[PDB]
Write an enzyme that holds these catalytic residues in place. Structure first.
Site, PDB file in Angstrom:
ATOM      1  N   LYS A 110       0.805  -1.221   0.000  1.00 18.15           N
ATOM      2  CA  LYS A 110       0.000   0.000   0.000  1.00 18.15           C
ATOM      3  C   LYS A 110       0.835   1.266   0.000  1.00 18.15           C
ATOM      4  O   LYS A 110       0.353   2.327   0.363  1.00 18.15           O
ATOM      5  CB  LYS A 110      -0.962   0.032   1.189  1.00 18.15           C
ATOM      6  CG  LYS A 110      -2.191  -0.843   1.017  1.00 18.15           C
ATOM      7  CD  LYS A 110      -3.186  -0.593   2.142  1.00 18.15           C
ATOM      8  CE  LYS A 110      -4.065  -1.800   2.403  1.00 18.15           C
ATOM      9  NZ  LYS A 110      -5.250  -1.831   1.531  1.00 18.15           N
TER      10      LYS A 110
HETATM   11  C1  LIG Z   1      -4.343  15.807  -0.056  1.00 14.59           C
HETATM   12  C2  LIG Z   1      -4.201  14.321  -0.216  1.00 14.59           C
HETATM   13  C3  LIG Z   1      -2.832  13.709  -0.178  1.00 14.59           C
HETATM   14  C4  LIG Z   1      -5.314  13.586  -0.388  1.00 14.59           C
HETATM   15  C5  LIG Z   1      -5.335  12.093  -0.571  1.00 14.59           C
HETATM   16  C6  LIG Z   1      -6.404  11.571   0.379  1.00 14.59           C
HETATM   17  C7  LIG Z   1      -6.614  10.080   0.257  1.00 14.59           C
HETATM   18  C8  LIG Z   1      -7.500   9.399   1.259  1.00 14.59           C
HETATM   19  C9  LIG Z   1      -6.037   9.365  -0.722  1.00 14.59           C
HETATM   20  C10 LIG Z   1      -6.304   7.874  -0.808  1.00 14.59           C
HETATM   21  C11 LIG Z   1      -5.037   7.090  -1.120  1.00 14.59           C
HETATM   22  C12 LIG Z   1      -5.342   5.616  -1.313  1.00 14.59           C
HETATM   23  C13 LIG Z   1      -4.562   4.856  -2.350  1.00 14.59           C
HETATM   24  C14 LIG Z   1      -6.278   5.000  -0.566  1.00 14.59           C
HETATM   25  C15 LIG Z   1      -6.620   3.533  -0.719  1.00 14.59           C
HETATM   26  O1  LIG Z   1      -6.209   2.827   0.453  1.00 14.59           O
HETATM   27  P1  LIG Z   1      -7.053   1.612   1.084  1.00 14.59           P
HETATM   28  O2  LIG Z   1      -7.493   0.528   0.005  1.00 14.59           O
HETATM   29  O3  LIG Z   1      -6.045   0.812   2.304  1.00 14.59           O
HETATM   30  O4  LIG Z   1      -8.305   2.419   1.663  1.00 14.59           O
HETATM   31  P2  LIG Z   1      -9.822   2.179   1.178  1.00 14.59           P
HETATM   32  O5  LIG Z   1     -10.214   0.654   1.232  1.00 14.59           O
HETATM   33  O6  LIG Z   1     -10.913   3.102   2.232  1.00 14.59           O
HETATM   34  O7  LIG Z   1      -9.926   2.751  -0.506  1.00 14.59           O
END
Ligand SMILES: CC(C)=CCC/C(C)=C/CC/C(C)=C/COP(=O)(O)OP(=O)(O)O
Ligand SMILES: [Zn+2]
EC number: 2.5.1.58
Lengths: 323, 407
Positions: A110
């Protein structure tokens, strides 16, 4: 040579090959904020990394040092930048480096920097031959990993490896039909190959989608995909759809089915159609059932839609004030 | 009446909002069922223990957590050694929301520290001597603006900042995150956030940028990291917010975007998910829910007559309920969901989210919903920059007195 998690691991300040270099302490200032109480191992490695970086020492020992600096903090993009400088300067075998990044991505999948590093390597080598299979393995442990899908899209687009991806999509939808990442990949593959204007392809997709809705009525992904591929041309352009969704009203009802009907009526009312007031009442009724019973969590959205549809599609809408 | 429950998540009907897996089990349904069960325990914990439910924001506990972390962090934050300005921003903004004075001793230290992070070539690094990067540059600038002093403002080297942004600009309108680094929609927003605050936007800086962001909107209604990718809350916020800044909100299908964002609020948990069919997470209380003030201001600019004059277009009550009941750590700080451990990131965005769900602002119309005890009320935040609305005005006004670098 010596691993970071090795029982016989020694600090760099206690290493001989490293006695010539003076370590560079972090310049945190007279009185610091958000100061991190680093461990012994951490500060030791980074004090020595700050030195080789400062001297721009492009040496083999420095290359090995970045491995430890990365292992301590894979999110340090400066260290990754220096390591790429080293890869070129020292003319390092890039397949060896690919073996290295494969390992690091497996353990910290990640992380932003690790995926970009792999991209850069593939770019340098012009070799995508390992990519689809590597990504598939990451997706086998986390089938929704954002960076993994993103890399897979970039690889497939750049190297034109479209041939087998739809089949891959079908396998993963089999495995988990609720996987929204896979429904996005399906839209990615189709729209970049055949497209959705081929009436036979648009036919095959919608039959497949309704078929999955029949099986799992409450899966939001299939509903969103059905909406996604038909709304471009207009939903009212497909008059059989409205009726076939009303067939599932008793046996396969869902808050998403009611919402879809509102979207169909919504487009119907935009493209002037038959009974331009009977259709409105049908929609406002369903909007209220949603805002008050079936989907209250979106009450503010569903009361907005009703107030938007009354704002332009009531019989009194285009009628002047004095009338 | 007296049989009536004032809390939306505790109401009997709310039980029907549990997941229906249609007897077809997949990894997605199983994992969502686990969270729902964990959230249920938290909800009916009051009936079981036979106590009257009260919703208290542990202001003093959070303050102590924040006051301390602002100075010193354990080796647990070694993985954030390249994100130290973020630590400044997350903490300072959290203090600002809880309405705590920032001692001018701390203010000047933060200033001095951020100055050490600033690259000779412009922008800020993750720490002293690190290469400049757009995420900590966004974080540094935001932090300095929260401080808002003349000392803070003068830290920023505007000529070099603009040079740096240029050196990252791509032909297709996107930006790199840093030199030799990746590209996604975060860079657009970071670039736009700092450029507009410091008044450094040249006519050509964001040429094609709005169109590139528009390409990021997909068939879901939402925005993905780069064109073709799945819609995601953090990226959607970045894109929309970046577009509001460039005044190009209308490049997007705002209709499908609204439908997508409002579908991200969980019917049972009341909090938000980052993308369709994934799990709730308190930090999306900002990234997702913060889009509604943006959409409200955009639609109102079009002259949308149907917009509410008191509420945002999400269940404000249910989001507050989720945060206060499920995202608070007893020892202080806030979190993703029950079972998760606190961090300063989730502390920052849970409270930013809560503030959003508490405050409605549309010109002259101002309405509040403060759930639980009235001391839960926070300072409002700007939906674009996520710093105090007064700090945004204060900073822009200051930097507008400077000329755009290069006359
Ligand atoms: C200003 C700025 C840098 C903004 C970015 C904010 C933000 C939350 C970006 C998401 C990055 C990302 C790849 C999340 C997926 O992780 P995951 O799969 O562990 O989380 P998930 O299952 O809720 O999509
Ligand atoms: Zn989170």
């Amino acid at each position: 040579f010596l691993s970071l998690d090795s029982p016989t691991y020694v600090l760099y300040r206690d290493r001989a090959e490293w006695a010539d270099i003076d370590p560079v302490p972090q310049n945190d200032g007279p009185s610091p904020v958000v100061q991190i109480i680093y461990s012994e191992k951490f500060r030791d490695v980074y004090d020595y990394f700050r030195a080789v970086l400062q001297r721009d020492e492009r040496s083999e020992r420095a290359f090995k040092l970045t491995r430890d600096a990365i292992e301590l903090n894979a999110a340090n993009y400066t260290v990754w930048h220096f390591r790429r400088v080293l890869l070129r300067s020292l003319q390092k075998d890039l397949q060896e480096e690919m073996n290295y990044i494969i390992a690091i991505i497996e353990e910290q999948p990640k992380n932003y920097q690790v995926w970009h590093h792999r991209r850069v390597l593939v770019e340098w080598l012009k070799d995508p031959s390992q990519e689809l299979e590597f990504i598939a393995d990451i997706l086998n442990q986390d089938a929704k990993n954002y960076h993994a899908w993103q890399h897979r899209q970039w690889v497939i687009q750049e190297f034109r490896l479209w041939d087998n991806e739809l089949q891959y999509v079908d396998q993963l939808l089999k495995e988990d039909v609720r996987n929204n990442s896979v429904w996005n990949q399906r839209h990615f593959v189709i729209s970049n190959t055949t497209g959705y204007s081929d009436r036979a392809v648009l036919e095959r997709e919608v039959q497949y989608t309704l078929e999955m809705i029949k099986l799992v009525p409450h899966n939001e992904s299939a509903w969103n995909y059905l909406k996604g591929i038909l709304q471009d041309r207009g939903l009212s352009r497909y008059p059989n759809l409205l009726n076939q969704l009303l067939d599932l009203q008793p046996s396969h009802s869902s808050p998403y089915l009611i919402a879809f009907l509102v979207d169909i009526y919504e487009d119907m009312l935009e493209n002037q159609c038959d009974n331009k007031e009977d259709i409105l009442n049908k929609a406002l009724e369903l909007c209220e059932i949603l805002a008050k019973e079936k989907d209250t969590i979106r009450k503010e959205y569903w009361r907005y839609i009703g107030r938007s549809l009354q704002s332009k599609h009531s019989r009194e809408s285009d009628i002047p004030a004095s009338v | 009446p007296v049989w009536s429950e004032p809390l939306y998540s505790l109401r009997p009907e709310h039980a029907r909002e549990r997941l229906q897996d249609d007897s077809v089990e997949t990894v997605t349904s199983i994992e969502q069922a686990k969270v729902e069960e964990k959230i249920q325990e938290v909800f009916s914990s009051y009936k079981f223990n036979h106590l009257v439910p009260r919703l208290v924001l542990q202001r003093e506990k959070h303050f102590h957590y924040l006051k301390r972390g602002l100075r010193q962090l354990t080796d647990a934050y070694e993985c954030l050694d390249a994100s130290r300005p973020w630590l400044c921003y997350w903490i300072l903004h959290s203090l600002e929301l809880l309405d705590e004075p920032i001692p001018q001793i701390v203010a000047t230290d933060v200033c001095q520290f951020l100055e050490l992070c600033q690259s000779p070539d412009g922008g800020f690094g993750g720490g002293p001597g690190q290469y400049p990067h757009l995420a900590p540059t966004y974080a540094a600038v935001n932090a300095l603006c929260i401080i808002g002093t003349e000392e803070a403002y003068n830290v920023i080297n505007r000529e070099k900042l603009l040079q740096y942004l240029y050196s990252l600009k791509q032909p297709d309108g996107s930006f790199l995150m840093h030199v030799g680094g990746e590209v996604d929609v975060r860079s657009a927003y970071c670039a736009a956030s700092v450029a507009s605050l410091t008044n450094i936007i040249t006519p050509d800086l964001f040429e094609g940028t709005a169109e590139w962001i528009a390409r990021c909107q997909n068939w879901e209604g939402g925005i993905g990291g780069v064109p073709g990718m799945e819609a995601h809350g953090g990226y959607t916020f970045c894109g929309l917010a970046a577009l509001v800044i460039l005044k190009k909100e209308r490049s997007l299908n705002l209709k499908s975007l609204l439908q997508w964002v409002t579908s991200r609020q969980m019917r049972f948990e009341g909090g938000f998910q980052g993308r369709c069919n994934k799990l709730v997470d308190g930090c999306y209380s900002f990234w997702q829910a913060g889009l509604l003030p943006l959409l409200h201001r955009a639609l109102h600019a079009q002259g949308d007559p149907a917009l509410s004059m008191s509420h945002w277009m999400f269940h404000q009550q249910a989001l507050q309920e989720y945060i206060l009941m499920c995202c608070q750590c007893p020892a202080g700080g806030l979190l993703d969901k029950p079972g998760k451990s606190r961090d300063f990131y989730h502390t920052c965005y849970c409270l930013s989210g809560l503030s959003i769900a508490q405050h409605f602002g549309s010109g002259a119309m101002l309405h509040d919903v403060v759930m639980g005890v009235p001391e839960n009320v926070l300072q409002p935040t700007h939906p674009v920059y996520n710093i105090g609305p007064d700090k945004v005005i204060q900073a822009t006004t200051h930097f507008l007195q400077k000329p755009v670098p290069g006359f």
